[PDB]
Amino acid sequence: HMSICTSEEWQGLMQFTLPVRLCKEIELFHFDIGPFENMWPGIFVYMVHRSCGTSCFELEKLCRFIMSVKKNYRRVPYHNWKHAVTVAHCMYAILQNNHTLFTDLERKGLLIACLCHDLDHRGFSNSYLQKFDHPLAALYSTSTMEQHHFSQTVSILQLEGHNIFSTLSSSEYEQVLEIIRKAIIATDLALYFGNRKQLEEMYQTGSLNLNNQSHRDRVIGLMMTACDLCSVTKLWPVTKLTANDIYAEFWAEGDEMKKLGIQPIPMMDRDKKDEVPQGQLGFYNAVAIPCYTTLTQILPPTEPLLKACRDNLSQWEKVIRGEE
Ligand SMILES: Nc1ncnc2c1ncn2[C@@H]1O[C@H](COP(=O)(O)O)[C@@H](O)[C@H]1O
Numbered sequence: 339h340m341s342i343c344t345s346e347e348w349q350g351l352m353q354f355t356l357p358v359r360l361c362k363e364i365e366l367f368h369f370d371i372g373p374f375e376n377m378w379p380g381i382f383v384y385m386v387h388r389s390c391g392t393s394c395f396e397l398e399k400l401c402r403f404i405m406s407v408k409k410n411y412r413r414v415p416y417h418n419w420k421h422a423v424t425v426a427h428c429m430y431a432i433l434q435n436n437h438t439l440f441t442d443l444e445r446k447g448l449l450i451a452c453l454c455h456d457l458d459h460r461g462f463s464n465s466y467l468q469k470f471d472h473p474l475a476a477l478y479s480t481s482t483m484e485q486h487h488f489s490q491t492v493s494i495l496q497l498e499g500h501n502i503f504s505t506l507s508s509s510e511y512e513q514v515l516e517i518i519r520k521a522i523i524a525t526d527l528a529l530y531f532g533n534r535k536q537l538e539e540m541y542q543t544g545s546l547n548l549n550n551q552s553h554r555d556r557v558i559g560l561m562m563t564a565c566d567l568c569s570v571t572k573l574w575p576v577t578k579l580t581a582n583d584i585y586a587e588f589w590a591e592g593d594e595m596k597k598l599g600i601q602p603i604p605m606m607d608r609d610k611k612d613e614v615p616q617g618q619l620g621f622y623n624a625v626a627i628p629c630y631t632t633l634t635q636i637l638p639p640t641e642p643l644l645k646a647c648r649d650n651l652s653q654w655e656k657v658i659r660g661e662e
């Protein structure tokens with residue numbers, strides 16, 4: 339059921355060399371992978387090697403894994419291969435700036451979780467799957483697509499020669515799979531609201547303790563949200579272009595809803611594009627800004643993400659004022 343990369347594909351990745359000039363740029367939060375499509379798999383290999391070490395994973399297995407993951411992302415407008423690498427890069431930047439706060443197991447687990455977090459996404463939301471009783475909603479009662487993304491991740495690891503984690507001891511192996519599962523489930527925005535509120539409180543009252551596993555899990559969860567939404571932390575033109583892709587998917591879902599006789603929310607109605615600017619303002623105020631605000635409080639080095647988010651909020655406000 340899973341697609342598998344070809345030998346030419348993973349061998350080509352093995353020989354890939356990343357232009358010296360990009361090595362420097364990849365360390366920055368605002369880096370946009372957009373103009374280097376042929377290099378995306380190589381960029382991920384580079385980040386893994388820099389954060390986890392060149393011998394962390396058997397190179398051959400890592401290349402097979404990466405190219406098969408790419409092949410299992412669909413050709414949809416937004417939840418695609420580009421998105422996966424973009425989210426993984428934001429995680430890389432967060433980890434590089436807060437390196438020793440995380441174990442080697444967590445770093446390899448999180449970079450992989452980010453690359454795989456939207457595996458096999460079809461362009462339809464949990465809202466849609468549950469409203470229309472898709473088989474996946476029956477199998478996974480909550481965080482439907484996310485539970486599916488994790489299942490897809492495990493399925494790729496099970497492909498012959500694709501298990502990059504097999505060299506871990508049995509206890510570390512079970513630990514990394516759990517790190518990956520929790521990280522992917524955390525990408526369900528529905529869970530973000532409660533997670534952020536809890537973390538904000540733990541931080542404000544001084545009870546937040548990274549030696550407390552449940553606390554670590556929550557911090558990692560907020561990091562996942564931050565990486566998943568990072569298009570809002572890029573330079574304005576990049577942020578705006580990505581929003582076009584996000585809405586292309588929203589509109590397609592809303593079209594299907596109308597076919598089933600249900601009026602979609604304005605955000606998914608292609609006949610209500612005039613409401614987009616206000617919709618974005620709402621998303622930034624209710625989701626993005628608070629996310630990066632709390633993340634910066636817990637991990638000070640991530641402040642550039644919050645500053646960039648605030649800048650884009652201002653841009654959407656300019657659009658609303660007719661200054662576009
Ligand atoms: N700028 C945005 N405006 C509205 N919704 C967004 C925006 N960026 C991300 N999202 C939502 O956040 C979700 C993140 O979860 P996912 O990308 O599926 O892991 C996306 O599926 C979108 O539904």
Ligand SMILES: [Mg+2]
Nearest residue numbers: 455456483525
């Ligand atoms: Mg997702």
Ligand SMILES: [Zn+2]
Nearest residue numbers: 421455456566
């Ligand atoms: Zn995503």
